[PDB]
Amino acid sequence: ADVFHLGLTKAMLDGATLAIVPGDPERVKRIAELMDNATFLASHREYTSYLAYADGKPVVICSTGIGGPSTSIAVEELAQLGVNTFLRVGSTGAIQPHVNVGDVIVTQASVRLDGASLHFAPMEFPAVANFECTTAMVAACRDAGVEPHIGVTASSDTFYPGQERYDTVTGRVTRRFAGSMKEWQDMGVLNYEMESATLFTMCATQGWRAACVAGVIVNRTQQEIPDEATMKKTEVSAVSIVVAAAKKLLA
Amino acid sequence: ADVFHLGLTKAMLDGATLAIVPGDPERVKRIAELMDNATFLASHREYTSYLAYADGKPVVICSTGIGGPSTSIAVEELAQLGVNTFLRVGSTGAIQPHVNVGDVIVTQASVRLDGASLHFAPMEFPAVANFECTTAMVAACRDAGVEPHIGVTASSDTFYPGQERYDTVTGRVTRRFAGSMKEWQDMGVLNYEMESATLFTMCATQGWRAACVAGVIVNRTQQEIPDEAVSAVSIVVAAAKKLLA
Amino acid sequence: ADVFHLGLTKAMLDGATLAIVPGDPERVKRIAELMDNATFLASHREYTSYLAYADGKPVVICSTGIGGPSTSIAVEELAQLGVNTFLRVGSTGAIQPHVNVGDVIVTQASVRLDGASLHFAPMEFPAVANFECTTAMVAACRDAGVEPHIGVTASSDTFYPGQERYDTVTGRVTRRFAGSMKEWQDMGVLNYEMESATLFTMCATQGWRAACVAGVIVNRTQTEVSAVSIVVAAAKKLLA
Amino acid sequence: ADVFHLGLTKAMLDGATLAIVPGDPERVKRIAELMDNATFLASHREYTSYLAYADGKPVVICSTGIGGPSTSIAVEELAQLGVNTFLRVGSTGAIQPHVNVGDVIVTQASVRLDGASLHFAPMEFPAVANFECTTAMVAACRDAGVEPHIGVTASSDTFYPGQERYDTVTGRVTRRFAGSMKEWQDMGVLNYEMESATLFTMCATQGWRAACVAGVIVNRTQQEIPDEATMKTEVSAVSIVVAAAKKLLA
Amino acid sequence: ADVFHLGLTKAMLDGATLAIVPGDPERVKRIAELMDNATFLASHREYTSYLAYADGKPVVICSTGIGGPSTSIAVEELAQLGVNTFLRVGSTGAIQPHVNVGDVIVTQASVRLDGASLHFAPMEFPAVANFECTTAMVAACRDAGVEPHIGVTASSDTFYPGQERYDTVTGRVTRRFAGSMKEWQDMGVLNYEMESATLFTMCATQGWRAACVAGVIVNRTQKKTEVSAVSIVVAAAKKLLA
Amino acid sequence: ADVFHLGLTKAMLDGATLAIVPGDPERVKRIAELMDNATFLASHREYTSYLAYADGKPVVICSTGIGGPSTSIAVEELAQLGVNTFLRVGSTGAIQPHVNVGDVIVTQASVRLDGASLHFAPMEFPAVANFECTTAMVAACRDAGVEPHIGVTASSDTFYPGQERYDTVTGRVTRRFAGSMKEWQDMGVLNYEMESATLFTMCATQGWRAACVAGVIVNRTQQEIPDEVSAVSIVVAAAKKLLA
Ligand SMILES: O=c1cc[nH]c(=O)[nH]1
Structure with missing residues (x-):
């Protein structure tokens, strides 16, 4: 490998400069398969990497893991291999009662409730897409067919105390x-998620482009965590949106 | 007046929900007269206001003076009169050597080198347009016919040390x-300017829309103060028309 | 001009080394007419400058605007012109029940609820007059015939939330x-005001003298000329 | 499952109250297989969980993924299931010239170069094991037959800037x-690693025990990154952590 | 004792509302003997207390120890026995070339390089006399006949590193x-000293008056002065109790 | 002297590389007499030093005064005289109700409610023993025969507000x-005490060894002020183990 964690060489990216970077190693293939000639590349730790082709052009799809430190490694290593553009797709807890389960959120910038963003800039620096x-x-x-929510996301180093979840061992x-x-x-x-503050701050400061789209899986004004009673029932998916965002940018 | 500083009542705004907020009380009238039926409202301290119309739509033009405290009182008090959109226009020092003088900058979000921003959100909150x-x-x-620079601005509570100016009395x-x-x-x-960090944080947190366009009058890779020698003010009136359509 | 904002030359000040720095431009002229030979100097943005003469010596009267950013520009640009002494006067409310309307406060030092003070020293530095x-x-x-309240002032970057006002659009x-x-x-x-922290920190750290007198015109918990009258006697005291 | 990420139920743990919490999901099974009756429990995201038996004592083995946020989820979720004790094993870079590649470090406390530890206690709180x-x-x-180094570990949210690596795209x-x-x-x-500050702070604050052993893979006084020239043959920190698990459950 | 550290009772102070609070226990008795009818009160830990009379008015002389935390105990427990004014006297070195050995410093406010100040108010609050x-x-x-330097003092939690001293074991x-x-x-x-920040902030926040004079016995950049400084502070006490 | 506050020369320590550092200048002779051939060295401000012999090896017993600034001087100046090990002994107020008045606490590490610690390392550095x-x-x-409480101590710059005591002049x-x-x-x-964060950060960072044991004199779940020894015999005993 040309990189220390991801298990990737520059050759394997076939000149890709754009990555879709989901959190979950298990989403990667589905993502890759909504594009042409999806190929497995590596799987190491939380980092599963496919190549695919958006309208003839190469696209790397690589998982980040949960939260900024795992994200920072992926993002640096992809960029060592010539990626200059990072499209995050993910799930998200809405904190606004008007933001329904199944709506899509485009995060334009992030509340820095992470520590990794501070390793790229002082807190005064905006975590901006x-x-x-x-x-x-x-x-x-x-x-x-979707008017997404566009605004500011709380990006947290924790899923529990930092998202003010109390259904926990100490409930403190x-x-x-x-x-x-x-x-x-x-x-x-x-909304809350756990990587956008880091991805944004490291992209903005290191001169790489980033954005973030995410499907809403729960409303925190009604449930701490989704359960079977939560609306699953599909519609227009954050994964389809990120792929078509990827086509817009390469075209 | 129905507000404590600006000398305004709501009636005076003729239903305007949008403000063009420049810094110089001496630039209000000129901006206003790029619109129709430029109307004096009020001049108190650093707060000169005009009402004008933009393709038939009422627009406040209100100066803020320099720096986020003075801006925060203009923006609060205007909102108390129905404004929900604040379009900032002005001048700037470019700090990148590819931003030429007479370039335009549109500010997506700002480094918070101010204090007023902290009176609306902790520093972890982005100072985002x-x-x-x-x-x-x-x-x-x-x-x-202008391709702007779009990105991050450093918004400083001072013109001198905070923007890393050495040509000062103490030079420290x-x-x-x-x-x-x-x-x-x-x-x-x-680039550096002195208000966008405040403007953006207070509007973002208080459910108001904001934005910032600015013309480049010095490049900081060359010199500290501008040589003593329209587009941004033209663009901000253009934008105001788009948003009120 | 010799200076980027205030539109002044060093010449215009006839060797003046003391400024009377009120916030409001529309107060300058009439502060300057309490002294001899009051002359219009410049008017730019929130900066209206006057010269006049205290017992034969020139004093500059220059407005700052509201808040430590615009203050910081005025103080620096006046100092580039040989000003070493900055007397602030103004009006204020109070947050103590024993401080009645008509009272005067001399602020000895300030709580640093501003950003621009941090552009001259870390927060540990006292914002001391x-x-x-x-x-x-x-x-x-x-x-x-005034016994002034001599104490600590909260110097806020904002009129509204920094002064914990809920009388606002959002009430937050x-x-x-x-x-x-x-x-x-x-x-x-x-009391609260919005400039004394920046002025204080910036003059302490850059080696200038400053002070701040203020008449009480309101008390949240429950004279304008006096405080101007007082600052002008202070200036003569200092220039005698 | 009764936890939201790990995919586990309490019964699956067979009364285990102690986890070994490596970073790498690829390595959970091998660590498990140093114990008895290794049993696959779940794999979701970076979280691979095994049960095994430590001289008849049930132990859960669960991967954390890299860094404090992913660790924090695993530890909260194991602890809902009755784990009260978390042994971190893993790799580390040495920052002292006398700390040799292949030595072992037992981290007694950590510099909090992380953000998730602040979700449990203010910075003044020590990240103590x-x-x-x-x-x-x-x-x-x-x-x-190993004298471990025992001291303070720099626990960093980033592999690169936060550990002062400059062999990066920007070199900044x-x-x-x-x-x-x-x-x-x-x-x-x-030494540097990326999880002990989060783990120690969330454990000390929540009333759960934690510790962390780690084998040195690189000395930062000599190389940013280990390569083929770096020393290949000694007592594994995995061997140590399983040994400690028996002692603690004895 | 009404108070847990100092071992004192309100009755022992004879209505004293003012304390001279030097750092060194061994100095208390002597400071006291510039005054009238000097009277031992208590000695516990670093806290030696005396009562003397300044122009017939009761004055407490109480040592603080070195630094903010020991100072904070003496100031709180004195105040519990009705002391409302605290005059600190000391020697100091000085970090300005224009401040000569034998000069006097009157500290008007202090840079907060202490932790105890923060136990009374956030850092934004000025450490003002x-x-x-x-x-x-x-x-x-x-x-x-002494013209004092009237300025800002750097109040440090440490004698060595907070005063950027390199003459230490590690030199770091x-x-x-x-x-x-x-x-x-x-x-x-x-100048640097080690207590004025704590003393200033706790007194400002709690509604008690404080002040600080110190003779300059050294200057990094480069007795009689100590007798001068303690003479000055006693003179100041009489001015305030008049 | 060879040092600026303590009034000690290196010669006076007789190759002692270990101090016992209680807080109270009045506790020092007493500790020293639990060892052999106890010798008054000096007394300056809050710094009273004795030498004694622990199974034949020199031990310095040096008071620190209250709180991190004074501890920091006594710790630095001892180390200038060859001291590398500092065992702190003292009193403490317990904040957990399962800690009995008269119990012993061994402080593994400290919450840094203290300023002197920051003069050695950023707050991120743990105040670990x-x-x-x-x-x-x-x-x-x-x-x-005593099972000591082992964990974390709140090490505060103030006895009153920093330990959230309200029985004060202002009660604020x-x-x-x-x-x-x-x-x-x-x-x-x-528990609460006032020195361990400074001691531990300053030893940790400076490559000296430090620990802390203390006897519980008040339970803060009951009251703020204590009502009117094992931890001192435990500290002398810990000193002999380390010198053995
Ligand atoms: O309660 C107590 C007892 C001793 N030391 C403290 O700090 N607090």
């Missing part, structure tokens, strides 16, 4: 994060 | 800002 | 300023 | 992390 | 304090 | 320390 790649995510939603949340969900709700913050 | 108004600025540039920059320019340069930050 | 100019401000109060105050009025009240903080 | 499980870690080294480290290796050096900080 | 006590101090200097200064002296020197900071 | 000296204090408890604690005792409680913090 690429304008042009956000534009293409928004457009790919609208083509899909440290002072900094006690009340914090209402703080972000009051500020019009749409 | 409204996507729709930003999209409207970008389009107005392209209608005028406190540690925290010593080498700060380069840091921002290396980060791909385009 | 010059002992000499503060003493002059006090003696002028007392000369006028961010967590760090939720409760913050009772905290300052309890620590004996006399 | 449990005294008992650290002692067991040291006893299981010495049982194996942000001002906070610039010179930071020298700083931890001078402080007698022994 | 009381204006009236400072004035008293300035005027007692002047009455002794942690990044925060690397270059820190030059920074304060540049900002006009006159 | 030395493994071996902590190990030694645990074994010296158990040899004495600043926002950062309001509700803080409950927070430390919920996190399993054992």
